[PDB]
Every structure is written in C-alpha cells, then in structure tokens.
Amino acid sequence: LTIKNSLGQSHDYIKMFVKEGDTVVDATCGNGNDTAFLASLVGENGRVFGFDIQDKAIANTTKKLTDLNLIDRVTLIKDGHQNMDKYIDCPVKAVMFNLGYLPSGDHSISTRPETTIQALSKAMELLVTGGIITVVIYYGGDTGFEEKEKVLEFLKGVDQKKFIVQRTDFINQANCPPILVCIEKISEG
Amino acid sequence: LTIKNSLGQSHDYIKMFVKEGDTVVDATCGNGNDTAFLASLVGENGRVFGFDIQDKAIANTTKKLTDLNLIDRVTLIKDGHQNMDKYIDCPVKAVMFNLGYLPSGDHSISTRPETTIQALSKAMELLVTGGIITVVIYYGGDTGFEEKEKVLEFLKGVDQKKFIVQRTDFINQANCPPILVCIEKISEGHHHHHH
Ligand SMILES: C[S@@+](CC[C@H](N)C(=O)[O-])C[C@H]1O[C@@H](n2cnc3c(N)ncnc32)[C@H](O)[C@@H]1O
Ligand SMILES: C[S@@+](CC[C@H](N)C(=O)[O-])C[C@H]1O[C@@H](n2cnc3c(N)ncnc32)[C@H](O)[C@@H]1O
C-alpha cells in the first residue's frame, strides 16, 4: 500500500463519488483516458460529456471509446469547457480537469487560466450537492506556472459555505510534482 | 459522502495502514481520543505507546482507556515525544501527531517547533517501511504560526527517495483550518551528501 500521486488520487476520489447512472464531465478530453474511466464507472444508463478544442483529441477519444465499446454513453463536444453550460442542463455528479497540454501532440495548445476559471465556475454551478470536481494541475513550464497561480488564487475565493476546496501537495518532491484540488459542493444558492 | 477535515482524514489514513498486532505511537496524548482510537485498531496482541508532558493529560487518557476496556495494551509515558527512542526499540507501524495545546486545559503549554522536529526525526527512524506518520497542524489563535512554518520547512527537506510527504489543505476556508501532513516511509536507509 502506497500513497498515490495526484493523477492517481483524482481517480480514487472520482470512484468514491460516482455511481452507475450518473451524469459526469470530462472537461479536458485529451487522448480519452479519463473519458473511458468515467464511462466505465457510469454504466449503460449513465452519461459522460467530453470536451476538447482539438480535432486530433476528439478523434483519438472517439477511437479509444469505440475500441472499448464505451462510445454509446459518451457525448463528445468540440468546444471549450468554458462553454459547458450550453450543452448540459441537468445536475452533474462529477467533473474532471487535467490541466496543461496534450501528450504526443501540439505543446503550444494548452489550457489558459481565463477559460479554466470560467469552466470551473460553470462546473461548480452544474454540480449536484455532494458532487465533486477534481483538478490535476501541472506547472512545469512558464505556461503551466502561470495557470497554477491564477487558478489557485481564484479557488481561494470560493465561498466555504457552498464549497469545500481541498488542496493536496507533495512538499518534499522537486521538479513541480502535480497538485490535486478537490472541489465538493455542500450547499446550494 | 463528504470530504473530511484534517482531523477526520488522519484517522482514515491510520485505518488504511494499521492492522491488528501492530506497534503504534500516539505522540501527543491530550485527552486520549487518538490513543483510544489506536488501541481499538491494534487489538489484544498490539501495543500503543502514548506520550504527554502534562500530568492532567496522562490522567485523563488513563481514565478514558480504563473506561473503554483498552488500558491493557497501552503504555503511557510522561515524557516528551522528542525522547520516544528511549522507550521504543521495535519498528512501529504508525505515529500520530496532533499539534497545539490541550483542549479544556492550559493554553500556554503547547508543542514547540524544536521538539516536534526532533520527535518527527525519531518517529521517522522508528517507522517500518510502508509505515505512516500523520501530523494534524493547528495554528493561529493562541497557538500562533511559528510551529506550522518551521515544521513544514523541515518536512520539505525530507528525502523523497525515503519518504512521501503529503500536505492536505483547505484553501477556501478562513480562520486557520487545520492542516494534515502524511509521511510514509518507502525505503530504509539514508542518502547523505558528501563532506
Ligand atoms: C493534459 S490534457 C488532458 C489529459 C487527458 N485526461 C488524457 O488522459 O489524455 C489537456 C487537454 O485539454 C485541452 N484543452 C486546452 N484548452 C482547452 C479549453 N479551453 N477547453 C477544453 N479543452 C481544452 C487540450 O487540447 C488537451 O488535450
Ligand atoms: C492538540 S493536543 C493533542 C490532542 C489529542 N490527540 C487528543 O485526543 O485530545 C497537544 C498535546 O501535546 C502535548 N505536548 C506538548 N508538548 C509535548 C511534547 N514535547 N511531547 C509530548 N507531548 C507534548 C500537550 O500537553 C497536549 O496535551
């Protein structure tokens, strides 16, 4: 038994909260790993909304899910996660954010603070009470660094009466260990 | 289902790691809540070492454990946790730290950075591989911020090849929400530099 990294822990937190038949969101599709993960947890009567701004990422995720017989429960949308409210009107149980750039792709196309903060606000509104958002933050680069600073600033201002914002950090590791943020809705209004 | 605070999460982390028959330590006895908790996890053939520097805290912990039929496997020691190596020679599975002053007690008698750091080194040495230390850090109020700052600065320096050090923090809460640090041993030995 070993304490998992932030990427591993996000899956563990999602498994705790997501049951079968739920509506969940992968806000950052990429290659489709988290999308397939969310799809397997949610079952045949559940729904996964997936978002990416790249055609390469949507195609790779479509390929992944079709291979695993999971494409039927997934709605893939080629739009920014900051516009997630245009496509979803029901309450969601969970939203996964994995911040940064697509692996084995274009490294100049990455998540931006402005649109991430927007998506987070939309995700927080869409959440059912007792619902979870997980944010795996990468900060290795200049662009990663800038996003971490801004996202965390924003999340520090979230009403504690409405949301629990939990940060998990490995403080003795060098070379920017990825940070986990868990946001759980506890009250409406 | 709700995400627990640091205090609640420390117990959850301890439950993950501690099985029956293990040797565990409560480094900050207080009223004996964590001591009782450790005693119930560890069973008849296990051992709990408890530490505090106050006579009031040892007596309240003794009363607690006797009331719950748990005093049998607990060794209560009226000494600082910085001296835990004088009393323990076997490898331990877990150590619990709860930093601050005694609740419903003397507010000026609290854990000090120097001795906490010492006890943390001793606990880290005493830990079996795959063992855990949990540290609930209280700060602000009468307690102040100096212990939090120094303990965390010390723990940032711990060899990552030997220990995982994980901080859990509620960043949208005001009024100094307690911080959880989890230290897990992943390797025996130590890498020292050169002189
Ligand atoms: C770190 S990757 C996600 C990792 C993914 N979970 C996986 O396993 O492959 C971040 C993704 O978010 C996408 N992205 C960047 N900006 C976005 C935006 N504004 N809205 C939605 N997605 C965006 C990128 O195209 C990239 O594929
Ligand atoms: C926050 S309280 C612990 C709470 C306790 N776990 C409980 O169940 O109530 C901190 C305790 O550590 C004790 N303490 C202070 N300095 C100590 C030291 N150097 N060694 C051992 N205990 C110490 C205090 O007397 C106090 O009882």
UniProtKB/TrEMBL annotation, chain A:
<dbReference type="GO" id="GO:0032259">
    <property type="term" value="P:methylation"/>
</dbReference>
<dbReference type="InterPro" id="IPR010719">
    <property type="entry name" value="MnmM_MeTrfase"/>
</dbReference>
<feature type="binding site">
    <location>
        <position position="54"/>
    </location>
    <ligand>
        <name>S-adenosyl-L-methionine</name>
    </ligand>
</feature>
<feature type="binding site">
    <location>
        <position position="52"/>
    </location>
    <ligand>
        <name>S-adenosyl-L-methionine</name>
    </ligand>
</feature>
<feature type="binding site">
    <location>
        <position position="34"/>
    </location>
    <ligand>
        <name>S-adenosyl-L-methionine</name>
    </ligand>
</feature>
<keyword id="KW-0949">S-adenosyl-L-methionine</keyword>
<keyword id="KW-0489">Methyltransferase</keyword>
<feature type="binding site">
    <location>
        <position position="81"/>
    </location>
    <ligand>
        <name>S-adenosyl-L-methionine</name>
    </ligand>
</feature>
<protein>
    <submittedName>
        <fullName>rRNA methylase</fullName>
    </submittedName>
</protein>
<feature type="binding site">
    <location>
        <position position="31"/>
    </location>
    <ligand>
        <name>S-adenosyl-L-methionine</name>
    </ligand>
</feature>
<keyword id="KW-0808">Transferase</keyword>
<dbReference type="InterPro" id="IPR029063">
    <property type="entry name" value="SAM-dependent_MTases_sf"/>
</dbReference>
<feature type="binding site">
    <location>
        <position position="33"/>
    </location>
    <ligand>
        <name>S-adenosyl-L-methionine</name>
    </ligand>
</feature>
<dbReference type="Pfam" id="PF06962">
    <property type="entry name" value="rRNA_methylase"/>
</dbReference>
<dbReference type="GO" id="GO:0008168">
    <property type="term" value="F:methyltransferase activity"/>
</dbReference>
